[PDB]
């Protein structure tokens, strides 16, 4: 063939922390189909917003918004237990269907995106350019969001373990841990990666008996 | 400057499932330092092997092995709660120190890797070549390992929730769930991504009351 139809930019969805997670990489021959499983961030969450993005930047806000839709009717569950499978499907005509399917409940919602959506040739180029001009800030951004999500995980996990421990936990351990979890929660409200890791480590430093209880 | 000293290939460590996780990207100017936090895969795990890798392939076995060392003395904890911070540090002389530090226990182990370790110019090139010749198989491999680790997570989580539920769970729910967890565990022993997702969904399909109990 003398030609190939390819995606000029990456396609994906916004995930927790405001980061674009890629489902179809830049430069993919179409027709193409890819799927990944995502989940909930909060206990008892009833819905997820799927926000479809085109572009090469790490910040979702820095990419082109192709549309969003909600999947609701997610049944009560602990965070991270629902299996929300997201599929990007680009048919032979260049049309993108994104769907989100709850593997438990069976619910499905889609958005269809025409082949002529997104950035034009000019902007595809200004976009590829910046992904490079800013490769650094993006990396610092992405690792901040990862730290933040790791801190939020440990925040939630440790609180749950404290409950499940209840009386097994000495009051001197419980006072230290709950003070660390307050400072953690205060830090996660910030954009300071080192300060988030300091409170994470503080918590790991005081939680050792908790961990030994939780393991038994 | 007319020259820059740069890393010709990516550097990292082997993580669960046999996948190389990159800590320093190909083409980085040295001196450079980067760190990431990893954790344990099993409850009560006492040690981690750090296995240092150079190269562009997704399978660790497909990369160049720069060395490995263990960090032990990890205190009893639930899986995924320890914070094992791994640092790659390439000084102005081209020497790589990799360290692993337990943020709770304070233990640290390192390996020092001389500047002349790894693949020579020829092999750097044969390596970059294959990362491309095989970009596909690598992606299929990496998403198999991710599915497998997501399935293992849900396997472990659901068993724990069954325990914490105990009598709250109807025996008709508990029989269905424990049968799904047996088939899941049988599938995770395989290299079939679709079969792993089938048992995951089977489990999500039978676990709904469990999820509603676990959330309360």
């Amino acid at each position: 063939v003398l030609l190939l139809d390819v995606t000029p930019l990456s396609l994906g969805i916004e995930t927790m922390g405001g980061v674009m997670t890629t489902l179809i990489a830049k430069n993919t021959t179409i027709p193409t189909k890819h799927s990944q499983v995502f989940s909930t961030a909060e206990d008892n969450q009833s819905a997820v917003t799927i926000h479809v993005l085109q572009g090469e930047r790490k910040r979702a806000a820095d990419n082109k918004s192709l549309g969003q839709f909600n999947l609701d009717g997610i049944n009560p569950a602990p965070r991270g237990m629902p299996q929300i499978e997201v599929t990007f499907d680009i048919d032979a005509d260049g049309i993108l269907h994104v769907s989100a399917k709850d593997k438990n409940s069976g619910k499905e919602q889609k958005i269809t995106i025409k082949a002529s959506s997104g950035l034009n040739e000019d902007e595809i180029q200004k976009m590829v350019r910046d992904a490079e001009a800013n490769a650094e800030a993006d990396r610092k951004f992405e690792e901040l969001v990862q730290t933040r999500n790791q801190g939020d995980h440990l925040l939630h996990s440790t609180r749950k373990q404290v409950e499940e421990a209840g009386d097994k936990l000495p009051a001197d351990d419980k006072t230290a841990i709950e003070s660390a979890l307050t400072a953690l929660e205060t830090a996660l409200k910030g954009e300071d990666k080192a300060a988030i890791e300091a409170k994470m480590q503080e918590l790991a430093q005081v939680s050792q008996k908790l961990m030994e209880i939780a393991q038994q | 400057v007319l020259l820059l000293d740069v890393t010709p290939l990516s550097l990292g460590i082997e993580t669960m499932g046999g996948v190389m996780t990159t800590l320093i990207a190909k083409n980085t100017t040295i001196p450079t330092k980067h760190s990431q936090v990893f954790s344990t895969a099993e409850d009560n795990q006492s040690a981690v092997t750090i296995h240092v890798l150079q190269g562009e392939r997704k399978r660790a076995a497909d990369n160049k092995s720069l060395g490995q060392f263990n960090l032990d003395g990890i205190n009893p904890a639930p899986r995924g709660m320890p914070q094992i911070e791994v640092t790659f540090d390439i000084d102005a002389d081209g020497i790589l120190h990799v360290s692993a530090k337990d943020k709770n226990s304070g233990k640290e182990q390192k390996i020092t890797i001389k500047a002349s370790s790894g693949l020579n110019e020829d092999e750097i090139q044969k390596m970059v070549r294959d990362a491309e010749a095989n970009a596909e198989a690598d992606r299929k491999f990496e998403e198999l390992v991710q599915t497998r680790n997501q399935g293992d997570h849900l396997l472990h989580s659901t068993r724990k929730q069954v325990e914490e539920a105990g009598d709250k769970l109807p025996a008709d729910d508990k029989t269905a769930i424990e049968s799904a967890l047996t088939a899941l565990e049988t599938a995770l022993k395989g290299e079939d991504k679709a079969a792993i997702e089938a048992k995951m969904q089977e489990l999500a399909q039978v676990s709904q009351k469990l999820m509603e109990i676990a959330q309360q």
Binding site: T15, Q36, V37, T40, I50, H51, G80, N149 | -
Partner: peptide, 7 residues
């Protein structure tokens, strides 16, 4: 609603 979180 919250954005999906990816494991």
């Amino acid at each position: 609603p919250p954005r999906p979180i990816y494991n």
